[PDB]
Short mmCIF file of N, CA, C and O in Angstrom, two decimals:
data_model
loop_
_atom_site.label_atom_id
_atom_site.label_comp_id
_atom_site.label_asym_id
_atom_site.label_seq_id
_atom_site.Cartn_x
_atom_site.Cartn_y
_atom_site.Cartn_z
N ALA A 14 -0.13 17.55 -3.49
CA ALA A 14 -1.09 16.58 -4.05
C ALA A 14 -0.49 15.15 -4.25
O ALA A 14 0.55 15.02 -4.86
N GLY A 15 -1.19 14.17 -3.68
CA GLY A 15 -0.71 12.82 -3.56
C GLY A 15 -0.76 12.35 -2.11
O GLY A 15 0.24 12.50 -1.37
N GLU A 16 -1.90 11.79 -1.68
CA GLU A 16 -2.07 11.27 -0.31
C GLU A 16 -1.82 9.77 -0.30
O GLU A 16 -2.59 8.96 -0.85
N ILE A 17 -0.75 9.34 0.39
CA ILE A 17 -0.32 7.90 0.39
C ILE A 17 -0.35 7.22 1.72
O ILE A 17 0.15 7.78 2.69
N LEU A 18 -0.99 6.04 1.82
CA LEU A 18 -1.01 5.32 3.13
C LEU A 18 0.09 4.26 3.16
O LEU A 18 0.09 3.34 2.37
N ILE A 19 1.01 4.42 4.10
CA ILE A 19 2.04 3.46 4.34
C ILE A 19 1.68 2.43 5.41
O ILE A 19 1.33 2.82 6.57
N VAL A 20 1.72 1.15 5.09
CA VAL A 20 1.46 0.10 5.99
C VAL A 20 2.76 -0.70 6.33
O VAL A 20 3.21 -1.49 5.54
N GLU A 21 3.30 -0.41 7.52
CA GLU A 21 4.67 -0.83 7.86
C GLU A 21 4.80 -0.99 9.36
O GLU A 21 4.58 -0.05 10.14
N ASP A 22 5.22 -2.21 9.82
CA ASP A 22 5.33 -2.49 11.24
C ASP A 22 6.60 -1.94 11.84
O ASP A 22 6.62 -1.53 13.02
N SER A 23 7.70 -1.91 11.05
CA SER A 23 8.97 -1.33 11.51
C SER A 23 8.92 0.21 11.47
O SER A 23 8.79 0.80 10.41
N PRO A 24 9.08 0.86 12.67
CA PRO A 24 8.92 2.28 12.81
C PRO A 24 9.95 3.10 12.02
O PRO A 24 9.67 4.18 11.51
N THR A 25 11.14 2.53 11.93
CA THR A 25 12.28 3.22 11.27
C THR A 25 12.19 3.10 9.75
O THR A 25 12.49 4.06 9.03
N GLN A 26 11.77 1.91 9.28
CA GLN A 26 11.52 1.70 7.86
C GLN A 26 10.36 2.54 7.37
O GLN A 26 10.42 3.12 6.27
N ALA A 27 9.34 2.68 8.19
CA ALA A 27 8.18 3.54 7.95
C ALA A 27 8.63 5.00 7.81
O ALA A 27 8.17 5.69 6.89
N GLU A 28 9.52 5.44 8.70
CA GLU A 28 10.09 6.75 8.67
C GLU A 28 10.90 7.00 7.39
O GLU A 28 10.75 8.08 6.81
N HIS A 29 11.67 6.03 6.96
CA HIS A 29 12.42 6.15 5.67
C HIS A 29 11.47 6.37 4.49
O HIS A 29 11.76 7.17 3.58
N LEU A 30 10.39 5.65 4.49
CA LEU A 30 9.37 5.79 3.50
C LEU A 30 8.71 7.13 3.59
O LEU A 30 8.37 7.76 2.55
N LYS A 31 8.50 7.59 4.82
CA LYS A 31 7.96 8.95 5.02
C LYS A 31 8.85 10.02 4.46
O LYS A 31 8.39 10.92 3.76
N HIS A 32 10.19 9.87 4.75
CA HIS A 32 11.15 10.89 4.29
C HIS A 32 11.17 11.03 2.77
O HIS A 32 10.90 12.11 2.28
N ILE A 33 11.39 9.93 2.06
CA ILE A 33 11.63 9.97 0.60
C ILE A 33 10.39 10.30 -0.21
O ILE A 33 10.48 10.77 -1.36
N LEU A 34 9.21 10.02 0.32
CA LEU A 34 7.96 10.28 -0.38
C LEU A 34 7.49 11.71 -0.17
O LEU A 34 6.93 12.36 -1.08
N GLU A 35 7.71 12.31 1.04
CA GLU A 35 7.38 13.67 1.29
C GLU A 35 8.37 14.65 0.61
O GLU A 35 7.97 15.71 0.17
N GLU A 36 9.61 14.17 0.47
CA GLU A 36 10.63 14.94 -0.23
C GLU A 36 10.34 15.14 -1.73
O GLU A 36 10.79 16.05 -2.35
N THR A 37 9.64 14.14 -2.29
CA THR A 37 9.23 14.26 -3.66
C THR A 37 7.83 14.87 -3.80
O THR A 37 7.33 15.12 -4.90
N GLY A 38 7.18 15.16 -2.66
CA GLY A 38 5.99 15.98 -2.62
C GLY A 38 4.69 15.39 -2.18
O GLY A 38 3.66 16.06 -2.20
N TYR A 39 4.67 14.12 -1.82
CA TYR A 39 3.49 13.48 -1.35
C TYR A 39 3.19 13.74 0.13
O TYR A 39 4.07 14.04 0.90
N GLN A 40 1.90 13.72 0.49
CA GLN A 40 1.53 13.68 1.89
C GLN A 40 1.33 12.21 2.23
O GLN A 40 0.81 11.48 1.40
N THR A 41 1.78 11.83 3.40
CA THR A 41 1.75 10.40 3.76
C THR A 41 1.08 10.20 5.13
O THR A 41 1.06 11.04 5.97
N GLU A 42 0.51 8.97 5.32
CA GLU A 42 0.03 8.54 6.61
C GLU A 42 0.61 7.17 6.90
O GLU A 42 0.91 6.41 6.00
N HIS A 43 0.76 6.85 8.18
CA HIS A 43 1.38 5.62 8.60
C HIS A 43 0.47 4.78 9.44
O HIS A 43 -0.27 5.26 10.27
N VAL A 44 0.52 3.46 9.21
CA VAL A 44 -0.25 2.50 9.97
C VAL A 44 0.65 1.27 10.16
O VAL A 44 1.57 1.05 9.39
N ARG A 45 0.40 0.46 11.21
CA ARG A 45 1.37 -0.59 11.57
C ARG A 45 1.11 -1.95 11.03
O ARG A 45 2.01 -2.78 10.87
N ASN A 46 -0.16 -2.28 10.74
CA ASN A 46 -0.55 -3.55 10.17
C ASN A 46 -1.76 -3.42 9.29
O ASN A 46 -2.35 -2.35 9.19
N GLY A 47 -2.25 -4.54 8.72
CA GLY A 47 -3.34 -4.54 7.80
C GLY A 47 -4.67 -4.16 8.49
O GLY A 47 -5.49 -3.46 7.88
N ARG A 48 -4.84 -4.61 9.70
CA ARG A 48 -6.04 -4.38 10.49
C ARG A 48 -6.22 -2.94 10.81
O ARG A 48 -7.33 -2.42 10.86
N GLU A 49 -5.12 -2.24 11.06
CA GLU A 49 -5.12 -0.81 11.26
C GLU A 49 -5.43 -0.06 9.96
O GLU A 49 -6.14 0.97 9.98
N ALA A 50 -4.95 -0.59 8.85
CA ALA A 50 -5.22 -0.02 7.50
C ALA A 50 -6.70 -0.14 7.19
O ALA A 50 -7.26 0.83 6.70
N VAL A 51 -7.31 -1.25 7.52
CA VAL A 51 -8.79 -1.39 7.43
C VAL A 51 -9.51 -0.28 8.17
O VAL A 51 -10.35 0.44 7.59
N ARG A 52 -9.12 -0.02 9.42
CA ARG A 52 -9.72 1.03 10.28
C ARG A 52 -9.46 2.44 9.71
O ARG A 52 -10.29 3.33 9.85
N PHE A 53 -8.27 2.63 9.13
CA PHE A 53 -7.97 3.88 8.46
C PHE A 53 -8.91 4.12 7.25
O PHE A 53 -9.42 5.21 7.04
N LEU A 54 -9.13 3.04 6.51
CA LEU A 54 -9.84 3.16 5.22
C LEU A 54 -11.36 3.26 5.37
O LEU A 54 -12.07 3.52 4.45
N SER A 55 -11.82 3.05 6.59
CA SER A 55 -13.21 3.29 6.95
C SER A 55 -13.55 4.78 6.93
O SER A 55 -14.70 5.16 6.64
N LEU A 56 -12.60 5.64 7.28
CA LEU A 56 -12.84 7.04 7.28
C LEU A 56 -12.14 7.77 6.10
O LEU A 56 -12.74 8.65 5.48
N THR A 57 -10.96 7.32 5.74
CA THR A 57 -10.13 8.09 4.77
C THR A 57 -9.75 7.27 3.50
O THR A 57 -9.42 6.09 3.58
N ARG A 58 -9.77 7.96 2.38
CA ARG A 58 -9.38 7.45 1.10
C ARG A 58 -8.05 7.97 0.69
O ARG A 58 -8.02 9.17 0.40
N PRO A 59 -6.97 7.23 0.65
CA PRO A 59 -5.70 7.70 0.10
C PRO A 59 -5.70 7.54 -1.44
O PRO A 59 -6.57 6.85 -1.95
N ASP A 60 -4.73 8.12 -2.06
CA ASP A 60 -4.54 7.99 -3.54
C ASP A 60 -3.79 6.70 -3.84
O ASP A 60 -4.01 6.09 -4.88
N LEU A 61 -2.89 6.28 -2.95
CA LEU A 61 -2.08 5.09 -3.15
C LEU A 61 -1.81 4.42 -1.80
O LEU A 61 -1.75 5.07 -0.77
N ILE A 62 -1.63 3.12 -1.81
CA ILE A 62 -1.26 2.38 -0.62
C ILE A 62 0.04 1.65 -0.86
O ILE A 62 0.31 1.05 -1.93
N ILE A 63 0.97 1.74 0.10
CA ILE A 63 2.22 0.92 0.10
C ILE A 63 2.13 0.00 1.32
O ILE A 63 1.99 0.52 2.44
N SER A 64 2.21 -1.27 1.10
CA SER A 64 2.21 -2.22 2.21
C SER A 64 3.37 -3.16 2.18
O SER A 64 3.76 -3.65 1.12
N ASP A 65 3.95 -3.43 3.33
CA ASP A 65 4.87 -4.51 3.55
C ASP A 65 4.08 -5.81 3.69
O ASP A 65 2.88 -5.80 3.73
N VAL A 66 4.81 -6.89 3.82
CA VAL A 66 4.19 -8.18 3.92
C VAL A 66 4.03 -8.60 5.36
O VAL A 66 2.94 -8.79 5.84
N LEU A 67 5.15 -8.68 6.10
CA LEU A 67 5.16 -9.28 7.43
C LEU A 67 4.67 -8.26 8.43
O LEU A 67 5.25 -7.20 8.61
N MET A 68 3.64 -8.60 9.18
CA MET A 68 2.88 -7.72 9.99
C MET A 68 1.99 -8.58 10.87
O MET A 68 1.57 -9.61 10.41
N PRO A 69 1.67 -8.12 12.03
CA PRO A 69 0.74 -8.82 12.90
C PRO A 69 -0.74 -8.61 12.48
O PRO A 69 -1.01 -7.67 11.79
N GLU A 70 -1.57 -9.55 12.90
CA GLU A 70 -3.00 -9.40 12.72
C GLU A 70 -3.35 -9.73 11.31
O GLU A 70 -3.96 -10.73 11.02
N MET A 71 -3.03 -8.85 10.38
CA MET A 71 -3.39 -8.96 9.01
C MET A 71 -2.19 -8.60 8.18
O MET A 71 -1.75 -7.55 8.23
N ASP A 72 -1.63 -9.59 7.44
CA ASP A 72 -0.43 -9.32 6.67
C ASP A 72 -0.77 -8.62 5.35
O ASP A 72 -1.92 -8.52 5.00
N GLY A 73 0.28 -8.16 4.65
CA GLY A 73 0.09 -7.41 3.41
C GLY A 73 -0.56 -8.16 2.26
O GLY A 73 -1.15 -7.49 1.40
N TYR A 74 -0.44 -9.51 2.22
CA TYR A 74 -1.08 -10.31 1.24
C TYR A 74 -2.61 -10.27 1.50
O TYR A 74 -3.38 -10.06 0.59
N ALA A 75 -2.99 -10.43 2.77
CA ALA A 75 -4.33 -10.50 3.21
C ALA A 75 -5.03 -9.13 3.05
O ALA A 75 -6.25 -9.08 2.74
N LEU A 76 -4.26 -8.07 3.21
CA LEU A 76 -4.79 -6.72 3.04
C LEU A 76 -5.05 -6.49 1.59
O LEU A 76 -6.13 -5.88 1.25
N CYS A 77 -4.15 -6.92 0.71
CA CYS A 77 -4.35 -6.77 -0.74
C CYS A 77 -5.59 -7.49 -1.25
O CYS A 77 -6.36 -6.95 -1.98
N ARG A 78 -5.75 -8.77 -0.84
CA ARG A 78 -6.90 -9.56 -1.17
C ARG A 78 -8.19 -8.89 -0.69
O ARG A 78 -9.13 -8.78 -1.46
N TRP A 79 -8.15 -8.39 0.54
CA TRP A 79 -9.28 -7.62 1.08
C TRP A 79 -9.60 -6.35 0.28
O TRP A 79 -10.78 -6.14 -0.06
N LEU A 80 -8.59 -5.54 -0.02
CA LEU A 80 -8.77 -4.33 -0.75
C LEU A 80 -9.39 -4.55 -2.15
O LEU A 80 -10.24 -3.81 -2.57
N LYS A 81 -8.93 -5.61 -2.81
CA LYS A 81 -9.45 -5.92 -4.13
C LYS A 81 -10.86 -6.48 -4.04
O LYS A 81 -11.53 -6.62 -5.10
N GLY A 82 -11.32 -6.86 -2.89
CA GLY A 82 -12.65 -7.37 -2.68
C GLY A 82 -13.69 -6.24 -2.53
O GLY A 82 -14.82 -6.38 -2.88
N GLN A 83 -13.19 -5.08 -2.03
CA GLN A 83 -14.11 -3.93 -1.75
C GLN A 83 -14.37 -3.09 -2.98
O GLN A 83 -13.44 -2.68 -3.69
N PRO A 84 -15.69 -2.85 -3.30
CA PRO A 84 -16.13 -2.27 -4.55
C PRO A 84 -15.68 -0.79 -4.78
O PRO A 84 -15.45 -0.39 -5.92
N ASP A 85 -15.49 -0.07 -3.71
CA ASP A 85 -15.00 1.33 -3.72
C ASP A 85 -13.53 1.46 -3.56
O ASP A 85 -12.91 2.45 -3.99
N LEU A 86 -12.88 0.41 -3.01
CA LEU A 86 -11.47 0.48 -2.65
C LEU A 86 -10.52 -0.23 -3.61
O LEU A 86 -9.33 0.07 -3.65
N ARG A 87 -11.06 -1.14 -4.41
CA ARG A 87 -10.32 -1.90 -5.41
C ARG A 87 -9.55 -1.05 -6.39
O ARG A 87 -8.55 -1.49 -6.99
N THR A 88 -10.00 0.20 -6.56
CA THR A 88 -9.39 1.11 -7.55
C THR A 88 -8.10 1.80 -7.11
O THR A 88 -7.35 2.27 -7.95
N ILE A 89 -7.90 1.89 -5.77
CA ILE A 89 -6.66 2.51 -5.22
C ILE A 89 -5.48 1.55 -5.50
O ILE A 89 -5.55 0.38 -5.14
N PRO A 90 -4.44 2.02 -6.22
CA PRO A 90 -3.25 1.26 -6.48
C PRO A 90 -2.47 0.88 -5.21
O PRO A 90 -2.26 1.70 -4.31
N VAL A 91 -2.07 -0.42 -5.14
CA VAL A 91 -1.35 -0.96 -3.96
C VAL A 91 0.04 -1.45 -4.46
O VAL A 91 0.16 -2.14 -5.42
N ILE A 92 1.12 -1.02 -3.68
CA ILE A 92 2.43 -1.54 -3.94
C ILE A 92 2.74 -2.52 -2.82
O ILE A 92 2.68 -2.14 -1.63
N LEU A 93 3.01 -3.73 -3.14
CA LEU A 93 3.46 -4.72 -2.18
C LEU A 93 4.99 -4.76 -2.11
O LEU A 93 5.61 -4.97 -3.13
N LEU A 94 5.51 -4.44 -0.95
CA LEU A 94 6.93 -4.61 -0.64
C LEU A 94 7.07 -5.96 -0.06
O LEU A 94 6.49 -6.31 1.00
N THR A 95 7.82 -6.81 -0.75
CA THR A 95 7.81 -8.25 -0.51
C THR A 95 9.21 -8.79 -0.51
O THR A 95 10.12 -8.22 -1.13
N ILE A 96 9.43 -9.91 0.19
CA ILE A 96 10.67 -10.67 0.01
C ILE A 96 10.36 -12.11 -0.48
O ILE A 96 9.55 -12.82 0.07
N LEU A 97 10.96 -12.43 -1.61
CA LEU A 97 10.72 -13.72 -2.25
C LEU A 97 11.86 -14.69 -1.99
O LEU A 97 12.78 -14.79 -2.80
N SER A 98 11.81 -15.41 -0.90
CA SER A 98 12.88 -16.28 -0.46
C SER A 98 12.59 -17.77 -0.61
O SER A 98 13.53 -18.59 -0.66
N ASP A 99 11.35 -18.13 -0.76
CA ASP A 99 10.91 -19.52 -1.08
C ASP A 99 9.66 -19.55 -1.95
O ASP A 99 8.95 -18.53 -2.02
N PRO A 100 9.37 -20.63 -2.69
CA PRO A 100 8.16 -20.77 -3.54
C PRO A 100 6.82 -20.32 -2.97
O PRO A 100 6.00 -19.82 -3.71
N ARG A 101 6.59 -20.52 -1.67
CA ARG A 101 5.35 -20.01 -1.02
C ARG A 101 5.21 -18.49 -1.08
O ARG A 101 4.10 -17.97 -1.14
N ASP A 102 6.36 -17.75 -0.99
CA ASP A 102 6.39 -16.31 -1.10
C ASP A 102 5.88 -15.91 -2.52
O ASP A 102 5.11 -14.95 -2.63
N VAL A 103 6.36 -16.62 -3.52
CA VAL A 103 6.00 -16.36 -4.91
C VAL A 103 4.48 -16.64 -5.15
O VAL A 103 3.79 -15.82 -5.74
N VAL A 104 3.99 -17.76 -4.61
CA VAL A 104 2.58 -18.12 -4.73
C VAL A 104 1.68 -17.12 -3.96
O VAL A 104 0.64 -16.69 -4.50
N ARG A 105 2.03 -16.70 -2.78
CA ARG A 105 1.24 -15.76 -2.01
C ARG A 105 1.19 -14.37 -2.69
O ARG A 105 0.16 -13.75 -2.65
N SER A 106 2.29 -13.97 -3.30
CA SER A 106 2.35 -12.73 -4.08
C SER A 106 1.48 -12.80 -5.33
O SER A 106 0.73 -11.84 -5.57
N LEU A 107 1.56 -13.90 -6.06
CA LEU A 107 0.78 -14.06 -7.28
C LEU A 107 -0.69 -14.09 -7.05
O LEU A 107 -1.45 -13.74 -7.93
N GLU A 108 -1.12 -14.49 -5.85
CA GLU A 108 -2.53 -14.64 -5.52
C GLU A 108 -3.18 -13.41 -4.85
O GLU A 108 -4.34 -13.33 -4.73
N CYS A 109 -2.33 -12.45 -4.40
CA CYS A 109 -2.82 -11.40 -3.54
C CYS A 109 -3.45 -10.26 -4.34
O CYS A 109 -4.31 -9.53 -3.83
N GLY A 110 -3.03 -10.14 -5.60
CA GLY A 110 -3.71 -9.14 -6.47
C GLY A 110 -3.29 -7.71 -6.28
O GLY A 110 -4.09 -6.82 -6.52
N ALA A 111 -2.07 -7.47 -5.82
CA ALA A 111 -1.53 -6.11 -5.71
C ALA A 111 -1.26 -5.60 -7.15
O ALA A 111 -1.18 -6.33 -8.11
N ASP A 112 -1.21 -4.26 -7.29
CA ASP A 112 -1.02 -3.68 -8.59
C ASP A 112 0.43 -3.63 -8.97
O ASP A 112 0.80 -3.44 -10.12
N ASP A 113 1.32 -3.70 -7.97
CA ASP A 113 2.75 -3.53 -8.14
C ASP A 113 3.51 -4.30 -7.07
O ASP A 113 3.11 -4.34 -5.91
N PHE A 114 4.61 -4.90 -7.47
CA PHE A 114 5.49 -5.62 -6.55
C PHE A 114 6.89 -5.06 -6.61
O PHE A 114 7.40 -4.77 -7.68
N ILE A 115 7.46 -4.83 -5.42
CA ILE A 115 8.86 -4.40 -5.24
C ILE A 115 9.48 -5.28 -4.20
O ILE A 115 8.96 -5.44 -3.11
N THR A 116 10.59 -5.88 -4.54
CA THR A 116 11.29 -6.72 -3.56
C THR A 116 12.15 -5.87 -2.67
O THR A 116 12.78 -4.93 -3.15
N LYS A 117 12.18 -6.20 -1.39
CA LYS A 117 13.01 -5.53 -0.38
C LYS A 117 14.50 -5.89 -0.65
O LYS A 117 14.77 -6.86 -1.35
N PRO A 118 15.45 -5.23 0.06
CA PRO A 118 16.29 -4.16 -0.39
C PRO A 118 15.98 -3.58 -1.72
O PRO A 118 16.05 -4.25 -2.74
N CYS A 119 15.54 -2.31 -1.77
CA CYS A 119 15.29 -1.62 -3.02
C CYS A 119 15.93 -0.24 -3.06
O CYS A 119 16.25 0.37 -2.01
N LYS A 120 16.11 0.28 -4.29
CA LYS A 120 16.51 1.65 -4.53
C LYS A 120 15.30 2.59 -4.32
O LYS A 120 14.21 2.30 -4.84
N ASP A 121 15.54 3.70 -3.65
CA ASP A 121 14.57 4.80 -3.48
C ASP A 121 14.05 5.30 -4.81
O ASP A 121 12.86 5.64 -4.94
N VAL A 122 14.91 5.32 -5.84
CA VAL A 122 14.62 5.82 -7.17
C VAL A 122 13.55 4.94 -7.82
O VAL A 122 12.65 5.48 -8.53
N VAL A 123 13.61 3.67 -7.57
CA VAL A 123 12.66 2.67 -8.10
C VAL A 123 11.29 2.79 -7.45
O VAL A 123 10.27 2.93 -8.13
N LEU A 124 11.31 2.87 -6.13
CA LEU A 124 10.11 3.14 -5.36
C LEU A 124 9.44 4.45 -5.81
O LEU A 124 8.24 4.54 -5.94
N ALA A 125 10.27 5.46 -6.04
CA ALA A 125 9.81 6.77 -6.52
C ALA A 125 9.07 6.71 -7.84
O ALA A 125 8.01 7.29 -7.93
N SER A 126 9.64 6.02 -8.79
CA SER A 126 9.12 5.95 -10.15
C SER A 126 7.84 5.07 -10.23
O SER A 126 6.97 5.35 -11.07
N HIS A 127 7.76 4.08 -9.36
CA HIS A 127 6.60 3.20 -9.27
C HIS A 127 5.38 3.93 -8.74
O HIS A 127 4.32 3.79 -9.31
N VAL A 128 5.56 4.69 -7.68
CA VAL A 128 4.48 5.55 -7.10
C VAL A 128 4.02 6.56 -8.16
O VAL A 128 2.83 6.64 -8.36
N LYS A 129 4.96 7.25 -8.77
CA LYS A 129 4.66 8.21 -9.86
C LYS A 129 3.85 7.61 -10.98
O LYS A 129 2.81 8.14 -11.33
N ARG A 130 4.36 6.48 -11.51
CA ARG A 130 3.74 5.80 -12.62
C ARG A 130 2.30 5.37 -12.33
O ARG A 130 1.42 5.59 -13.13
N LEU A 131 2.09 4.76 -11.15
CA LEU A 131 0.81 4.29 -10.74
C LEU A 131 -0.15 5.45 -10.43
O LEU A 131 -1.36 5.29 -10.61
N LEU A 132 0.39 6.61 -10.04
CA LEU A 132 -0.45 7.79 -9.75
C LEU A 132 -0.76 8.63 -10.99
O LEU A 132 -1.79 9.35 -10.98
N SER A 133 0.06 8.53 -12.01
CA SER A 133 -0.29 9.13 -13.31
C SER A 133 -1.35 8.32 -14.01
O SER A 133 -2.15 8.86 -14.81
N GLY A 134 -1.40 7.02 -13.71
CA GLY A 134 -2.38 6.09 -14.25
C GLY A 134 -3.79 6.31 -13.74
O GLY A 134 -4.77 6.14 -14.49
N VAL A 135 -3.91 6.72 -12.50
CA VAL A 135 -5.22 7.09 -11.87
C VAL A 135 -5.52 8.60 -11.95
O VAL A 135 -6.16 9.15 -11.02
N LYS A 136 -5.07 9.29 -12.96
CA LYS A 136 -5.51 10.64 -13.30
C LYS A 136 -6.45 10.60 -14.49
O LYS A 136 -6.55 11.56 -15.26
N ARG A 137 -7.14 9.46 -14.62
CA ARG A 137 -8.15 9.24 -15.69
C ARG A 137 -9.56 9.00 -15.07
O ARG A 137 -10.43 8.44 -15.74
N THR A 138 -9.75 9.34 -13.81
CA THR A 138 -11.04 9.37 -13.14
C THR A 138 -11.27 10.68 -12.37
O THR A 138 -10.32 11.25 -11.82
N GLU A 139 -16.59 13.95 -5.94
CA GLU A 139 -17.82 14.12 -5.26
C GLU A 139 -17.76 13.88 -3.75
O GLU A 139 -17.06 12.99 -3.31
N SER A 140 -18.47 14.73 -2.98
CA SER A 140 -18.53 14.62 -1.51
C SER A 140 -19.41 13.44 -1.08
O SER A 140 -19.14 12.81 -0.02
N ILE A 141 -20.40 13.12 -1.89
CA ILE A 141 -21.36 12.06 -1.60
C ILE A 141 -21.33 11.05 -2.74
O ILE A 141 -21.59 11.37 -3.91
N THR A 142 -21.07 9.78 -2.37
CA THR A 142 -21.20 8.66 -3.27
C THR A 142 -21.88 7.43 -2.59
O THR A 142 -21.60 7.10 -1.46
N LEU A 143 -22.84 6.87 -3.28
CA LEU A 143 -23.63 5.76 -2.75
C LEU A 143 -22.88 4.42 -2.93
O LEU A 143 -22.19 4.22 -3.90
N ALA A 144 -23.10 3.53 -1.95
CA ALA A 144 -22.51 2.22 -2.03
C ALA A 144 -23.54 1.19 -2.45
O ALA A 144 -23.63 0.11 -1.89
N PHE A 145 -24.37 1.58 -3.45
CA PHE A 145 -25.39 0.68 -4.06
C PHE A 145 -26.03 1.33 -5.32
O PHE A 145 -25.92 2.53 -5.54
#
């Protein structure tokens, strides 16, 4: 129990995220950019999303802004994996509206506890639901 969508362009980094999250017991799915995540979320609802920033088509900031715009999807917790190397990085992060920020190079332990914490938070909420 725990279905997590990983949004990551680097195949090896995606794999590392796959390893450490499945080892703690989550089921995971992988997508390469934000636009693919949109296509995924048309059919499937994950419990949590982890997105990197740098990606083709639709970057992680843009995906977060989009997710928080959608009335049924805004509730899914998003972790932004980000690198803050200049003031524009800080501004883009502050505006994207992710639920959690983790800067790259990170400890697996920290990523682990963040996922856990955010997922214990959404244990306070049907086959058919109307979108109106």
